Design a protein around this ligand. Structure first.
Ligand code: NAD
Ligand code: NAD
Ligand code: NAD
Ligand code: NAD
Ligand code: ZN
Ligand code: ZN
Ligand code: ZN
Ligand code: ZN
Ligand code: ZN
Ligand code: ZN
Ligand code: ZN
Ligand code: ZN
Lengths: 395, 395, 395, 395
């Protein structure tokens, strides 16, 4: 008995029966280092949206989902730290724990788990074949390495809405803020008010930023951010970002900027916001970040976009105003979040009431049968982070 | 009075009589903090070549040169640590010493010395109208802050050909290597076998790199790099860069990469290399740097190139394969070198024979009258670094 | 007309007429780089107390005070950035701005301003003879480099009780926390609930620490810390520090520990707390900081203490259980805070209401005539930070 | 079929027959993650000497040796990257690869492999009861995480004298130098011309230091250091170290200082050097390191020393002149080397002839039966590093 969300072509996902998990890798070799989880909570990601919209090279039939929190039901013979019944947060990265990059804390780019390229992840295009976890049950390989044990079940269940964000979005937003150099007193600009943008804004606040400005083209997502105490920039109005920031800060620049949009970026302005223009965020962040600043880029950029705007963009080439960044001495930091690097201290923050992440990103808890509908609302721009409770454990 | 190298329009320089330096800034306000130097040695740079070629917005009449070594002949009334006769290395950055960026060692982007933008330099486009120093005498403002005191004059003069590199190219090459993450045992690729690239190679050697490979489309420069003990990759051949690297290393990746080419980049291959393609280096570096690696970009890129290949490149926009670097978790480091942050320890290294920079870059000493001829030769691609001795002090 | 707080021997200070400041250094040479301030607010520090208790080699007649906020009334001819009437925060460190340590942001240890050793500061033993500023007027040398310009007078004056802490204690407490490695999610122990200890605790809250525990032997300072939302360890109880921490956290250790006591440390327990044992804090921090942790030590330790417990301590030797910290792989960070490294970002934090520093440290505003009484109360251990308003400008 | 070096009480070691390795931990539990090695080379360490001299709480019967290079002859059933015949470097830390410290690269203080405290190592006091490897065969647990693969056996054995240093002393010396802040152009002082000190000196050279001065009380070691091209300081002479340094550099300070002596430190001077004084090195490093400088302390300090000079030292407590370090703003870095952090890039530098470590540390190859003789000669202070070749594979 297993089931989950399956990708079936542009705009299409459905809940299907799927195989119960097996203690083997995606090439069918047996493994001793894995566990099988009964899934407690499992979220929908903006990355999942890229795939569902037909924006990647994903195969039809892909089981989706890489934001898992779970409870051990089966343990492979080599696993030392796990017991049946243990609650765990699963980092979205599949990492081996023994290669050059895993050992150097670069668990987003594991050298062994994916025959095609460095880096692995559950239910995710080009990520080594590991089955996704928007499902009733899921296999986690290298369990001793990857898993974050949650505190006593009671206190954990009590904050599950928060803890479900440790799998992907909070550590990601956090990595965005830290690589952009955010610290106490920083002025911060955040591109994107989606779940990831909002997590970067929360992270920046937690890191002690003086002021945090969140930008989007979506007015409902900005209203959400504003109700959460952040400053906003509306990129659908005709007033340029520079001008919006200056009205707020008294200069047209920030200390730190985070790109939480990626390759489906829209342009700015009345008509610009209705046009896809994937270099937009990059170019505008070079424009607003002060000299010697750092740009953090958690937003996803791909080597291949079948639906992209032009030949160059189909192959991940953007028209980027690099001379500007260079003239401003900017440095840029990119790539999949190494979730494990931050997830334990972020847990401490949640448990100690330092960060109300669930309120901030607008967590909504849904049934597994509502998942397709959840994707639909998410696609239609709702200011929410959808959390699937597939066994009805806490809803 | 004084005389020096003057730019007269695309491809034209000549030595002219010019005013003796005055104790005032480019706005004509008196300064108490400056010194006037008799110029001992003064170098020709690839940056100078960009301007001479008419590839920047540099005006006719500009006095050239930002790589100065001198002797103090006059000091302003507020200068406390400099005395007459003192022999000094001058960082190419003009920096104030008291703004936010100068305090934080970002002295390539001083916020007060330039009304146009952050950052200053001598005889350099968009760099605040500080007068160039390919000349007999030159003004250095903020002398206590900027100047590097050279060792008792005998010892200094005997290593003049080396120390003349401290003003620009050695610290610049060094910046590129350290921001690319080079250290003991690193494998390193450097694009560009011009003097800056050779300084980057020298720096990586100093740092204890396991192996250093220098790439260029100009075979006579690669011959020179090879005779200095470096590995080479010839981009004018049709053999792809990753294949030349694998033949040297046994894998197609380096740990660290440095872009010492900048915006006049040629394409790769027999015919590709005969044509300008400004994004080529950046794209190639993402291709051969290993995941989670760092890319150092000392090479110059501009916000405006009058003679660029395309409308986009005229504005500093390049077709960059960003999605590739993003998928490899690359980080990118850019901009004008903070020369002061490294010049002291590099001088130490020079004085203790840990680095034979003059040999590595191919230093050649010339008379001031020979400057126009030297620019011609350098522009034609000879494997040399031209050092002007305007008062015939050591030649 | 000038007057200040003067040190007159163990336990003794009085307010005296003193010379109006002069544009010369402590050796009587004219300087062009200084300003004179009309003092707006000027604070009493724990460092001042060491000196008043006769615990240092401070000479009788020392004019005290290194915590200055002021209004420019005079300007030396070399000064570029200052105007009469400007409101400024004065970092307690006297720094030149052009030596090796000043350039690398080590402005607590300037090489040029003190003939006796590295590092200068106002009204401070062994700190170069710069006159103190617990006075109506004071000289600030190297004004362009050292001074922090405050916001429109009106907004600045309104937050004076907060901003006055930028001269010394907030940056210091901050340096304590950052060098101890504090970050989002940290568990933090801070030794000392004095104004500096409190600033460290505030800094740790601002840095996003999960839980902050402040320890002291003083019951009244702890009741004040507890009112400000911090956890407490009462070292006057017989319950050892381990046990109090473990009761609080469920393990007898913290990620990060800051020493905000210094060389007049008391031992632990009913009677231990009435004994001086200068090694106490260092040894107990090594006991409760987890493996590979960092210990930040802002608390002052001296080369000479005329009033110490024994021979060894009079020369700054302590019996330190180094083997313990070594076995735990601890790192240690020490010395005068480089205030300029942090003050600007801290000002932004204050102006944006991210840190209510005045309330936390218990700012109390007094007249210059009440200063001796202030010293008295401070010495008796009141949980307050004394701020003198010498011209009655805001009180 | 196995034997090795067994400790029998103060001053006494002998070769005995010992059990063949079993695939279990020191508690007798079965493990699937280990491999068994035929030992190729296995070294004698100063750490071993501490124990043999009776200066630790090490038990009679302890099998010695933590510096192993070997070939895999048997693999556990869960091992994924090791094959029989594989030739490997063993880091001396026993590390699990799944706990908090292991993941953060703090593999010197693993939290799971040792019931007594954090940190594990082979045949080493308080290090988890993992059996030592000056033996014919040895167990390495967590093989996929811990082992460093060496290349074609042929190229590897030709450099075996160098390669055998990667297990312990080269990465130790390297850790000491990097944490002392050593970089291109650094001036460095290293206390101790034992093998570890010599490896720090080699490291500092590799890292590009301007000048490296090694001190010792043992002149036969200093003769060796000088022959290896380093500067020396003789601490058995009455000339104070700061004067010896000034003679060499023209100032009495260094940029970086490394303590490669540890808890059996001798005093300085004709008579001082003849007596044990365990605070001596730490105290003199604070004396000669420049302000804001960093002190690396790879030398061992213990929480309990049975034969220490006084009551306090038996407990790991030293009379440290901390006031002086504090006034100079020193940082201090301590503890067991995380060998995995550095071993990969040091192997690269060895294979590409960037460091001739075996020559520098004075490697001498001996039989297993001659081990007691090696220990004796090493204790008499010869300038050599003993490498045991148990199966006569390359001697
Ligand atoms: N590095 C990582 O680990 C990582 C992890 C998850 C997601 N991501 C990427 O981060 C992005 C965030 O996902 P999300 O969860 O935020 O999904 P999302 O797609 O809902 O959020 C993207 C937001 O960007 C907005 N936007 C579009 N153009 C914009 C512009 N010009 N300026 C500002 N905002 C603009 C969209 O309206 C949307 O609100 C996704 O692209 C995701 O792929 C990266
Ligand atoms: N960051 C700084 O502060 C700083 C300082 C000085 C110079 N620079 C910049 O560094 C760059 C180099 O200066 P230089 O004196 O070394 O320049 P240079 O003009 O002598 O040489 C540049 C080299 O790049 C080579 N090249 C062109 N396309 C190439 C490709 N695709 N691959 C490999 N090589 C290619 C050319 O053959 C040439 O040999 C210049 O652009 C200069 O403006 C920056
Ligand atoms: N590094 C710097 O730049 C710098 C700057 C300012 C102050 N300091 C030093 O920091 C310390 C803090 O200064 P302050 O203004 O808070 O002075 P303070 O003397 O009021 O603070 C010291 C506090 O520590 C308490 N204490 C004594 N023994 C203790 C122990 N074992 N554990 C915990 N607490 C103990 C005392 O009760 C007192 O409350 C002083 O030493 C000051 O000199 C250093
Ligand atoms: N950090 C680690 O993980 C690690 C690893 C290996 C060894 N160690 C420790 O490193 C130390 C040295 O390594 P080794 O094997 O070369 O040690 P060793 O004992 O062979 O040599 C120590 C040297 O220091 C000299 N010495 C003694 N007092 C001195 C003083 N006051 N000043 C200068 N030199 C003095 C001794 O004569 C001897 O030459 C030992 O303490 C060892 O326990 C630590
Ligand atoms: Zn995701
Ligand atoms: Zn891996
Ligand atoms: Zn140049
Ligand atoms: Zn400046
Ligand atoms: Zn103070
Ligand atoms: Zn200074
Ligand atoms: Zn050892
Ligand atoms: Zn471990």
């Amino acid at each position: 008995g297993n089931r989950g969300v399956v990708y079936l072509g542009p705009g299409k996902v459905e809940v299907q029966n799927i195989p119960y998990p097996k203690m083997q890798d995606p090439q069918g070799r047996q493994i001793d280092h894995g566990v099988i989880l009964r899934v407690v909570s499992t979220n929908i990601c903006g990355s999942d949206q890229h795939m569902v919209r037909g924006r990647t090279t994903a195969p039809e039939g892909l089981v989706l989902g890489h934001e898992i929190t779970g409870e051990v039901v089966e343990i492979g013979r080599g696993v030392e730290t796990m017991k049946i019944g243990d609650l765990v947060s699963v980092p979205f990265n599949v990492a081996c724990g023994h290669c050059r990059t895993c050992k150097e804390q670069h668990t987003g780019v594991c050298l062994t788990v994916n025959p095609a390229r460095a880096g692995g992840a559950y239910g995710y295009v080009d990520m080594g074949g590991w089955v996704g976890g928007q499902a009733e049950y899921v296999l986690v390989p290298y369990a001793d390495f990857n898993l974050l044990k949650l505190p006593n079940r009671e206190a954990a269940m009590e904050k599950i809405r928060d803890l479900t964000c440790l799998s992907d979005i909070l550590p990601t937003g956090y990595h965005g803020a830290v690589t952009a150099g955010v610290g106490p007193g920083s002025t911060v600009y955040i591109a994107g008010a989606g779940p990831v943008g909002l997590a970067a804004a929360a992270s920046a606040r937690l890191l002690g930023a003086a002021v945090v400005i969140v930008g989007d083209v979506n007015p409902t997502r900005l209203a959400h951010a504003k109700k959460q105490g952040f400053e906003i920039a509306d990129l659908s109005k005709d007033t340029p970002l520079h001008e919006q920031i200056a009205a707020l800060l008294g200069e047209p620049e920030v200390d730190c900027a985070v790109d939480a949009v990626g390759f489906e970026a829209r342009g700015h302005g009345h008509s610009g916001s209705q046009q896809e223009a994937p270099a937009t965020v990059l170019n505008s962040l070079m424009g607003i970040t002060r000299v010697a600043g750092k740009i953090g880029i958690p937003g996803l950029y791909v080597t291949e976009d079948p639906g992209a705007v032009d030949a160059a963009a189909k192959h991940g080439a953007l028209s980027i105003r690099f001379g500007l960044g260079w003239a401003k001495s900017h440095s840029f930091h990119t790539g999949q979040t190494p979730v494990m690097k931050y997830n334990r201290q972020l847990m401490q923050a949640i448990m100690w009431d330092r960060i109300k992440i669930a309120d901030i990103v607008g967590v909504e808890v849904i049934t597994l049968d509502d998942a397709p509908k959840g994707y639909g609302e998410f696609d239609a721009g709702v200011p929410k982070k959808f959390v699937i409770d597939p066994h009805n454990l806490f809803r």
